[PDB]
Design brief:
About 10% of the residues lie in helices and about 45% in strands. The chain has a single domain (about 1-184), classed as Lipocalin (Beta Barrel). The chain has three helices and ten strands; from the N terminus they run H-E-E-E-E-E-E-E-E-E-H-E-H. The termini are far apart. Bound molecules: protoporphyrin IX containing FE and ammonium ion. It is found in: Secreted.
Length: about 180
């Protein structure tokens, strides 16, 4: 189950975060593992498309090759805190699994600047158990976590040493698909 009410960044700059560009997950902390794989790849694009707040997601398991994309129109709970009802799509935006009640994630931006971010997410997917997942993001897929985002991890009363890196997985991303999925 999810247990955290994550606090959004004071003074969160939504237009900068939701600028249409890509964010890569560099490190993550799942509070209820044996539930996500140790080795994983994920990225997202976040932007406004025709007036609608959107996120496109990519997941890739580098060992199994399991791959999937999603798109959601985000609803606002408060500044920096969103609810996202997702649809599974192919890379071109064709629907594989339609939006449904009970398929949603929450999304809280705890820290962001132009190059880095710390987010919390709680995924609800049908009758699957939910659990808290924190992710350190960067605009540069290869960037080591810097002092701004590591300090934010500490300020959330988390230990960065517990986060698992994605950097050793040979992750290659289709940035073009993520950007184009924002419109879909
Ligand atoms: C921005 C961060 C992330 C968000 C918003 C997010 C969101 C989601 C969503 C919406 C799904 C369901 C997709 C679908 O069924 O259509 C999903 C599935 C999954 N995610 Fe993430 N995810 C994120 C990062 C990660 C990371 C870093 C991992 C690490 C392993 C991960 C592991 C998984 C796994 C294993 C599933 C499949 C769940 C299942 O059906 O059993 N995710 N995620
Ligand atoms: N997830």
């Amino acid at each position: 189950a999810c247990t955290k009410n994550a606090i959004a960044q004071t003074g969160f700059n939504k237009d900068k975060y939701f600028n249409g560009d890509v964010w890569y997950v560099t490190d993550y902390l799942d509070l209820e593992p044996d539930d996500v794989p140790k080795r994983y790849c994920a990225a997202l694009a976040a932007g406004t498309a025709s007036g609608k707040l959107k996120e496109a997601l990519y997941h890739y398991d580098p060992k199994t090759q399991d791959t999937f994309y999603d798109v959601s129109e985000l609803q606002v709970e408060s500044l920096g805190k969103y609810t996202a009802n997702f649809k599974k799509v192919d890379k071109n935006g064709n629907v594989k699994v339609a939006v449904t009640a009970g398929n949603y994630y929450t999304f809280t931006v705890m820290y962001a600047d132009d190059s880095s971010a710390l987010i919390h997410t709680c995924l609800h997917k049908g009758n699957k158990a939910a659990g808290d997942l924190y992710a350190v993001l960067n605009r540069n897929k290869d960037a080591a976590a810097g002092d701004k985002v590591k300090s934010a991890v500490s300020a959330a009363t988390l230990e960065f040493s517990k986060f698992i890196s994605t950097k050793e997985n040979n992750c290659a991303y289709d940035n073009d698909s993520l950007k184009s999925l924002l419109t879909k």
